[PDB]
């Protein structure tokens, strides 16, 4: 399916902000030229899933920050100082100060056989912030390594080592310090998980 | 600094437009928010390299179009109705109508020993156009497959096949129609080059 590797913000019942990775499916717009809709498949028991099921709201972000995706895939990141309330939606939706694009969404349909969730969401608002760097082989390899290192069922040692090596090479060839940092964090996570 | 996987337009001596992949190094500005410089390392004997050395001009594009990268990596694409001359630079630079961002550049320094050219370029003009889709694992794997398909004379068949297989997996999971088409075109190129 057509999937964006995003960061999502949500709020709990007390307004506490959560930031986590999500891979929403991009759905057709309601009208030609219109904003995308999204199919969200949050993981049961996650803070994102709890907050979506309670509030109906989220903000999906297009980012070129592979380091932040890696950090929030591996552990919790305090996002309280990373976000600003969205105009028109200040009590329900917050966006990252640094991103390329944000989509403030609200759930329109719900389905899924427990424990799966399928939440259709439409945009209430969207905006552009920073330019996107562009394709970068190091960022891409950080994403692959982070996905590999955080799978529900552990990959065989040879497979995870292959992803880490491909990342090392791509980062040496094309990356910067945030990508170097990301790989070190992912390597730590892999070492601590075995 | 980071390397951008870009599309570059250049013009030959008769004004003919070329569109091809380039991986320039992005040199940061002195001040946050300023325009960057680029280090261009074009491939000796390529149309892009010939035009850069002759004119000193190019337009570098940030694109989310992995299909177009694949097409121009594996063969010539007629870019005549993809680009338009840039006002103020209309005799020397053309830009893609569809892109996220473009930088019209001019070479300020030539270095390197042939066949490895190293050209420093500064920005004459730039702009934003379309939003960027975002990270997509299928687009990323199409880029890696396209790089491998340009290296049939440098890599064994099993290594190129493994890049094609990683693309298949990423496209099934995350891709759309352009990425599916890109992998078909790349596989066809690999098959044709083997025979």
Can you describe this structure?
The PDB classes it as structural genomics, unknown function. Keywords: structural genomics, unknown function, flavoprotein, PSI-2, protein structure initiative, New York SGX Research Center for Structural Genomics, nysgxrc. The assembly is dimeric. The entry is titled "Crystal structure of conserved uncharacterized protein from Rhodopirellula baltica". 2 copies of one chain form a homodimer. Chain A is α+β, with helices and mostly antiparallel strands. Chain A folds into 2 domains: 119 residues, Pnp Oxidase, Chain A, CATH 2.30.110; 75 residues, Methane Monooxygenase Hydroxylase, Chain G, domain 1 (Up-down Bundle), CATH 1.20.58.290. Helix content of chain A is 34%, strand content 27%. In chain A, the strands form 2 sheets. In chain A, strands 2-1-5-8-9-4-3 form a 7-stranded antiparallel sheet. A two-stranded antiparallel ribbon of chain A has the order 6-7. In chain A, strand 8 and strand 9 form a beta hairpin. In chain A, helix 2 packs parallel to helix 3, helix 2 runs parallel beside helix 5 and helix 3 packs antiparallel against helix 4. The longest helix of chain A is centred in the C-terminal third of the chain and has 18 residues. The radius of gyration of chain A is 17 Å and the shape is globular. The two termini of chain A are 32 Å apart. The interface between A and B is medium-sized, with 32 and 31 residues.
């Amino acid at each position: 399916s057509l999937i964006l590797e995003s960061l999502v913000t949500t709020l709990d019942e007390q307004g506490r902000i959560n930031l986590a990775p999500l891979g929403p499916i991009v759905l057709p717009p309601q009208s030609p030229g219109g904003l995308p809709q999204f199919l969200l498949r949050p993981y049961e028991g996650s803070t994102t899933c709890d907050n979506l099921l309670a509030s109906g709201n989220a903000v999906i972000h297009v980012i070129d920050d592979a380091l932040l995706i890696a950090k929030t895939a591996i552990g919790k990141v305090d996002a309280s100082d990373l976000v600003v309330p969205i105009p028109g939606l200040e009590d329900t939706h917050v966006r990252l100060k640094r991103c390329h694009r944000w989509f403030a969404v609200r759930v329109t349909q719900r389905a899924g056989t427990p424990p799966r969730h399928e939440l259709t969401a439409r945009c209430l608002a969207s905006g552009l912030v920073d330019p996107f760097f562009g394709f970068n082989r190091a960022k891409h390899a950080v994403i692959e390594a982070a996905v590999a290192a955080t799978r529900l069922h552990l990959l065989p040692p040879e497979e995870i080592e292959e992803e880490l090596e491909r990342a090392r090479i791509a980062i040496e060839k094309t990356g910067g310090e945030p990508e170097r940092e990301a790989l070190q964090l992912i390597r730590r996570h892999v070492r601590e998980s075995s």
